[PDB]
Structures are given as C-alpha cells and as structure tokens.
Design a protein around this nucleic acid. Structure first.
Ligand SMILES: CCc1c(C#N)c(S[C@@H](C(N)=O)c2ccc(C(F)(F)F)cc2)nc(N2CCC(N)CC2)c1C#N
Ligand SMILES: [Zn+2]
Ligand SMILES: [Zn+2]
Length: 842
DNA sequence: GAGGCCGCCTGC
DNA sequence: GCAGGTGGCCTC
C-alpha cells in the first residue's frame, strides 16, 4: 500500500533514505508538492514540498515537509489571491501516512520585460486573480511582514539528495546569532586572548568601538543627587482656581523618562576563561573596554551637552569587563587630531562615527590630552514625488544622496512654488494626479503648460504621501466608502507605481494608515503591490528617533522591484521618550513589528527644544520682519547643522501669528515653569492692549464630581455640570482670562491638558501642526519663555528643515507647508537604507 | 478675515 | 479613567 521504489541511498544510523515512494496509485519523489489534512477538518489543506524520504527503524516511513504559507495566513488575509502561496522558513519531519495527495505548484517568475508590463486598472490590482493552479512568487517573513524575492540558497554535493532550503537558512541564522571568537592572540595564566570575534554578522577586533547598554558599567564620577521635584506645592486656590485640574503629574513633551544613550567603549581585550585543562571556554566570551565619557557623563553634567557635538566623547583610562553578548553593535571612535579629513566630513561620511580630542580624569576633573596608545559614486535615481508639499521628503532623500527629484506633483500652489524655489531643475505639475496619468496613458508627451510628462523608464523611484479623505475612519468598509477608496488618491498613487514600475517605491502617511477601516486600507495597498510583483513591507517610525525634537509617528510602506534588494527600516539614532515610540501594529489580531532592534537605547542623546531654537532672537507676538539678524553664532550641534557651513547673514521667516489682545494677555500670564498651561492662569481682571477688559471667571454651579475649593467656592461654570440638565445659555461667560469653554467641558476632555501650554526647553514639540492655535487640539504651542506662539522658523526647526530651505506665501501658507512635510532627517534615514540596497544589488 | 467651541473612537 | 488621534464650523 505504501512501498519504497528501489533500494536505499544512505544508511545514516536509524534512518534509511530513499528517492521515490509509491502510495496507492501515485508515486512521490523528492521535489514533489503534496497536501496534508490538518487535525481540524474545517481548516484548509496544508501544502508542502517533499525534500527527503526515509524509513525510521522505530517510527516507520517518514518525509520532510517544507511548508508553503497560504496567502490568507499572511498579513494580506482574505484580500489574497486564493491560489497564491508564499515561501516560508517552516519545515518539519512527518510520517508518510499524513500525506493526502500530490498537488501542482508552479513558480510564477517575473519576466525579463517586467518593467514594461504595467497598466492594469485598479480593479485588477485590488481584486484580480491569477486564475490558474497553485503558484508562488515571493518569500514571506511572518514576524516583519516582508515579501521578498525567493532566496537563491544553493545546495551542496553532499546534501543534494535530502536538501531542504528552510533547514539550511535556519542553520545559517542560528550560527549568525551565536557569538564566536576567531583569531587567538595570546595564552595568559587564566584567560585566552583573541584578536577578533563575531556576533550577529558583525566583526569585532581589538581596538574597535562597541555600543553597550547603559547598565553595562558606571563611571567613576561620584554623581550628586539632583534635587527631586517635591509634590505640587499648595497654591492660593482663589487666585488660581483651575490649578486643581493638574492632579495628574504627567507632562506632555517632557524628557524625564527618556532612556540614557549607549555606553561606548573601545575593546582592549577579547578573552575567554580557561578550563582546568587549559582549553578556553569559548561559549562564554568576555571583553575588556576602556570607558568613554560623553560630555554629560563628566562632572560638568547635562549642560555640557548643550554646545558639544552629538558624537563628541572624551577618552579615559577607566576600564570595565562585560559579557560579549551584551554588545549592542559596533562603532568607530577615532582620535580627531589624526584624521586624514576634517571632523565634519568624517562625521557626515558614515554611520556610528564618534571622535575624541581630549582625555578626561575623573579624580582630577581635568582634561589632559590623550596618551599615545589612543591612536592607530552611485548615480542618483530619477525620482517622481507625488503630493510633494514644499519638499521635505525630497529634501531628505537628496541629503541621503540617492535621488534627483526631476518631477513633482503638488496641487496646492503655495507649496508648489516653495518646491520650485528649492528645486530649480525639477518639473512641478499642479494638475490632479489622475489627469496626468490619463494623459500619459493616452500617449501624450506634454501637459497643457508645455511641461514634458515622465514616460516609462524615466521614473526610477516613486515617493509620496496621499491623503485618505473619506476613509480615515476605523470602522469597517461598506460599499459606499469602498467606492471612495478605489477612486482615491491612494489607489491613484498605486496606479503610478503599476504604470512606471520604478526600482523603489515609498508611501508615507499618518500612523493610523495601518488601522484605517479595520486595516483594510493597508491590506489592500500591500495586496496591490504583491499583485504587481513587488517586494514590499510596512512599518511605523517615530521621527524623534532620527534627530528632531518632535513626536511624529508615520506609517511607511516600502517596495522594491524584482531584481532589487528590499530595504530594511532604519535603526533609531537618538533616544526618545518611550511613550512616543509605540511602533507595533496589530492586523487581524496578529502583531507585527519592523526589523528595528534598538528598543531600549541608542547611539545619540535626544534632541530638545533647547537644541532646536535656543539661538533664535527674541521676537514679539505678531512679529512680521521677514529678514532679521541672528544676533549670534549657532549654539548647539543641531543649530550648527541646520544653519549650514556657509555663513548666513540673514535669518528668514522668524515670524509669528498676530494673536488678538485677549489671547495675547492669556499667553503673558502662562507661567514659565515646565508643564504650565491654561490651568495655571490667574483669575483676575486685566486691561488689554486695545482698551478692552478681561473679566474674572465666576463659578456659578456645584460640580459634585469636582467638589469645591479650599475656601468653599464652587467649581462649575454651567448648569450642565449636573446630571441631566442642559447648557443654560445665560450661564455662558464672555471675555474671561480663564477661557470659559475649558472648565465647561474639561471633565470629558482630560481637562484640556496642553491648551495654552508652553513648550519646555528640556522637552520636545508635540506634532508640528499646520496652524498653531493655543485653544485647538494641539494647543501646546507657546514659546518656553516669550509671550507668543512659536514662529514659522521654530516650526521649521522642529521638522529638521535647514534654515536655507525656502518657503512661500503668507504666514499661514508657510505654517501649513512646514506642518504638512515629512521631516528631512526621517526621510534621510529612510534614504540611507535605500542606498544600501543600491550598493548591494547583484 | 479669526476666534470660540468642542464628539467619537481606540489602547492601556 | 487617562492619554493619543483626527479639524471643522459655527458666528462675528
Ligand atoms: C479635540 C478637538 C476636536 C477635534 C480635533 N482635532 C475634532 S476633529 C473632527 C471634527 N472636527 O469634526 C474630524 C474627524 C474626522 C475628520 C475626517 F473626515 F477627516 F476624517 C475630520 C474632522 N473634532 C472634535 N469634535 C467633533 C466634531 C464636532 N462635533 C466638534 C467636536 C473636537 C473636539 N472637541
Ligand atoms: Zn527543513
Ligand atoms: Zn453647559
């Protein structure tokens, strides 16, 4: 009934391998594909390739199954082609009696003319099927939701008869993870020294720099205990009646909980303890390092970090011993006064680069000079940027060195003009992107302005951020909203990708793009890319982790053409508040993360509001001078980067909105202490700059939930604070310094935390918005000390724009251009991941 | 033109 | 309950 076809081919102990087996009326050979029924009969069939066939002396006839992954089991879910399978690194030994039948599974490889095969309508992208047998084209990573071209892992001549691609790749991954020593240096009395060791694919040698977690070692600086902020001191509750609403100790935009960046050391020794027989215990690798000081680790403490370069260190003679498994990565730490090039071009020429010029003596608290023993392109992609705005994403890609944006599409004219001023060689289209694509597909060569349209082969990279108006809710699709989606700018952008078939594709959006419409927007987007034959992935990034003093999470979809390497997401560069770094995504109860491994720390300290704008001159509410003096040199590393190399005599766009007299009076009475907002306003009369008056807020109803003040005063300002009573229109009070509407509805809006809120010098910006309004949702827009809202220039700094980047229009147009942009430091980090793929292409 | 006003949903 | 995430549209 089940019988081997022939004789054995290898007797490996208790296993007898065969090349062919006959089951009932069928014959199976290595390489065939088969189905297996699960224990749950309602579940669909399991499908696998047979990689080996053998008899076991105890268990009987066996085979090795290299499982396929059904499309529904991927992030695509039910949007998947019902007959599409995906390769995965999942396999197991199995008895032959579990085999149900033989199946045909074909490999649908992209053609050599794949770049010219695009042009299918949205219905075919969204809902079209291959309409054939079972097939696969892509390999799938279930943890990271990555679709990639199938691996080309070659067999041996030894294991060809039983070769399993999944087994080989799993073995490669396991060995790549375990730390190993390579080249033995010297045999000591108690340890064996080594010249080099490897971990996670990285080579470590004596003298190399290593990243370590902050807990790896301490410094010999006997720290002093900072004066911990006491409990909220009692205030005069009649002068500040709304101060009680600050019972939460949480401060928006505060950096009190951001982790320390990495400890940094230079490898002095790589060693293993010796067993009694003299052999080294190579399963327990240790390293000895010299401790490097960051400026803030010295006695000068945190203020030493204000002016210092973010990659400046101080050599020291202190030493520590840590486990090799604790090393978080490799870095370069060089003596500055021996570099072939200047420090700035060194620091900008590669990742993980640090430098030192002096040494630090903790006992002496002095800075001597270091001892003697401390010393030893690609053509850019032609890019089309859709929904470009003023050009933040293009600017970051340009800094990464990967792109020339030769075409841009921007329908809002002030942003289009801004893009032109910064990109004089680019062609900027103002038409609706559907119109342009229709013209190109009709065979047109120029638009109605005479501008040459991009044709197939011109576009090598496509990037953009499409709005999602009409389907940015969380509720499920219905027939109405699904119609709006297939006619949406998201789908139009995907049609550009299908038509032009660039080498690389990038879609950026608000974080909730991954959750819109029960994640169907994300799932359909990935479905379209797979249907085109693209490798693709998705993830969420926090802009503050790449060098801005701003919390801004963005959803990122990356795609790479067949023949390309699919980029990884960039590792965080700066530590940031952990509350703002929630990057995981749940799709259909399956949790997805990106390849990012820096979860607890990072190489550089967090960028603060101080780093962002401490150098800008004081200006008034309503400041309108477009060109002023800086009044001094840049003070921080961040300011030195954004001001640039060439001296800039003129500071542009340090202008602020002209708030009304009442609002200006409110801002003038928000205290400067961190976390101050409308709840710290005094309840007083104040004469305004226009002769009018601001009135005392009167408490006219009893709020049983909130109680009464210490002097017995009420805390409700309307009858609606009762259970069922409605807002009595006579209870509305006007022109009060404490705005009436905030105590009115504060009980159900978390007390309107942050409204009329001041930024904190040591903290970060909330998400930079298109129109700073102190009483809007993102109300924390007051300057840390000046009685005004943040200026256009300050908002640009919070986005990481260079001071030379030109904006266009009135002040509200400039705020909108800044607030809508992708921060260039985030775009640059993504661009450098793309550059790695350009250089590694086979 | 700008300022007052303020719902619904989700993750924890 | 707390905190984050989406502007819009009333009226002057
Ligand atoms: C916290 C501030 C705020 C905000 C804020 N920020 C918003 S945003 C909201 C709105 N403005 O309608 C919205 C939602 C979705 C879209 C989309 F279509 F684009 F998806 C557009 C606007 N709504 C709010 N309330 C609901 C609408 C009105 N009853 C007034 C109160 C409130 C409030 N209090
Ligand atoms: Zn296997
Ligand atoms: Zn009311």
């Amino acid at each position: 009934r089940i019988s081997w076809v022939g004789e054995a081919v290898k007797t490996d102990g208790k296993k007898s391998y065969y090349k062919k087996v006959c089951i009932d009326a069928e014959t199976l050979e290595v390489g065939d594909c088969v189905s297996v029924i699960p224990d749950d009969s309602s579940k669909p069939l399991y499908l696998a390739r047979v990689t080996a066939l053998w008899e076991d002396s105890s268990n009987g006839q066996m085979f090795h199954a290299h499982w396929f992954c059904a499309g529904t089991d991927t992030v695509l879910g039910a949007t998947s082609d019902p007959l599409e399978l995906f390769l995965v690194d999942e396999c197991e030994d199995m008895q032959l009696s579990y085999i149900h039948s033989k199946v045909k599974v074909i490999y649908k490889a992209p053609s050599e003319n794949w770049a010219m095969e695009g042009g299918m309508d949205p219905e075919s992208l969204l809902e079209g099927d291959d309409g054939k047998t079972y097939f696969y084209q892509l390999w799938y990573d279930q943890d990271y939701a990555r679709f990639e071209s199938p691996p080309k892992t070659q067999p041996t001549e030894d294991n060809k008869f039983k070769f399993c691609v999944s087994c080989a790749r799993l073995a490669e991954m396991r060995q790549k993870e375990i730390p190993r020593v390579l080249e033995q240096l010297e045999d000591l009395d108690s340890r064996v020294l080594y010249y080099s060791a490897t971990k996670n694919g990285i080579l470590y040698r004596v003298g190399d720099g290593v990243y370590l977690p902050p807990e790896a070692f301490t410094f010999n600086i006997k720290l002093s205990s900072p004066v911990k902020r006491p409990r909220k001191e009692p205030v005069d509750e009649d002068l500040y009646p709304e101060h009680y609403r600050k019972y939460s100790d949480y401060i928006k935009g505060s950096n009190l909980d951001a982790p320390e960046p990495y400890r940094i050391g230079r490898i002095k020794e790589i060693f293993c303890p010796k067993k009694s027989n003299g052999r080294p215990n190579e399963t327990d690798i240790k390293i000895r390092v010299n401790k490097f000081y960051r400026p803030e680790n010295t006695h000068k403490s945190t203020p030493a970090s204000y002016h210092a370069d973010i990659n400046l260190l101080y050599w020291s003679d202190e030493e520590a011993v840590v486990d090799f498994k604790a090393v978080q990565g490799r870095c370069t730490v060089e003596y500055g006064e021996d570099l072939p090039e200047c420090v700035q071009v060194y620091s900008m020429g590669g990742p993980n680069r640090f430098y030192f010029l002096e040494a630090y003596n903790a006992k002496s608290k002095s800075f001597e000079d270091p001892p003697n023993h401390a010393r030893s392109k690609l053509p850019k992609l032609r890019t089309l940027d859709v929904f470009s705005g003023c050009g933040g994403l293009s600017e970051g890609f340009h800094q990464a060195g990967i792109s020339d944006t030769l075409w841009a599409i921007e329908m809002w004219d002030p942003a289009a003009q801004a893009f032109r001023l910064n990109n004089p060689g680019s062609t900027v289209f103002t038409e609706d992107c559907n119109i342009l694509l229709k013209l190109v597909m009709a065979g047109e060569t120029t638009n109605s302005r005479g501008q040459r349209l991009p044709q197939k082969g011109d576009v090598e990279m496509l990037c953009g951020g499409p709005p999602c108006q009409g389907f940015s809710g969380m509720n499920r699709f219905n027939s109405r909203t699904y119609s709006k989606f297939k006619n949406s700018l998201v789908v139009s952008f995907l049609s550009y990708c299908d038509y032009y078939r660039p080498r690389f594709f990038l879609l950026e959006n608000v974080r909730n793009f991954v959750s819109f419409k029960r994640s169907m927007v994300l799932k359909l987007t990935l479905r379209c890319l797979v249907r085109m034959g693209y490798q693709c992935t998705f993830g969420v990034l926090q802009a503050g982790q790449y060098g801005v003093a701003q919390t801004r999470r963005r959803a990122i979809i990356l795609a790479a053409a067949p023949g390309e390497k699919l980029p990884l997401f960039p590792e965080p560069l700066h530590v940031f508040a952990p509350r703002a770094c929630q990057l995981s995504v749940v799709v259909d109860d399956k949790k997805f993360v990106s390849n990012i491994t820096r979860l607890s720390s990072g190489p550089f300290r967090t960028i603060t509001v101080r780093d962002t704008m401490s150098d800008l001159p004081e200006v008034r509410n309503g400041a309108s001078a477009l060109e002023i003096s800086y009044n001094g040199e840049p003070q921080s590393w961040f300011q030195r980067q954004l001001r640039g190399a060439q001296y800039q005599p003129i500071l542009r766009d340090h202008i602020c909105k002209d708030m009304s007299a009442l609002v200006a009076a409110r801002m003038r009475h928000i205290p400067l202490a961190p976390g101050s907002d409308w709840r710290d306003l005094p309840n007083i009369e104040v004469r305004l700059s226009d002769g009018t008056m601001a009135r005392k807020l009167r408490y006219t109803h009893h709020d049983r939930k909130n109680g009464r003040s210490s002097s017995g005063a009420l805390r409700g300002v309307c009858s609606c604070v009762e259970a069922g009573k409605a807002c009595d229109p006579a209870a509305r009070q006007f022109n009060t310094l404490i705005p009436w509407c905030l105590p009115h509805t504060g009980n159900r809006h978390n007390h309107w935390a942050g409204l009329y809120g001041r930024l904190e010098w040591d903290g970060f910006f909330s998400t930079t918005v298109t129109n700073p309004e102190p009483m809007g949702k993102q109300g924390r827009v007051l300057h840390p000390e000046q009685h005004r809202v943040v200026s256009v220039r300050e908002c640009a700094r919070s986005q990481g724009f260079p001071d030379t980047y030109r904006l266009f229009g009135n002040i509200l147009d400039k705020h909108r251009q800044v607030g809508n942009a992708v921060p260039p430091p985030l775009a640059k980090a993504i661009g450098l991941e793309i550059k790695l793929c350009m250089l590694a292409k086979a």
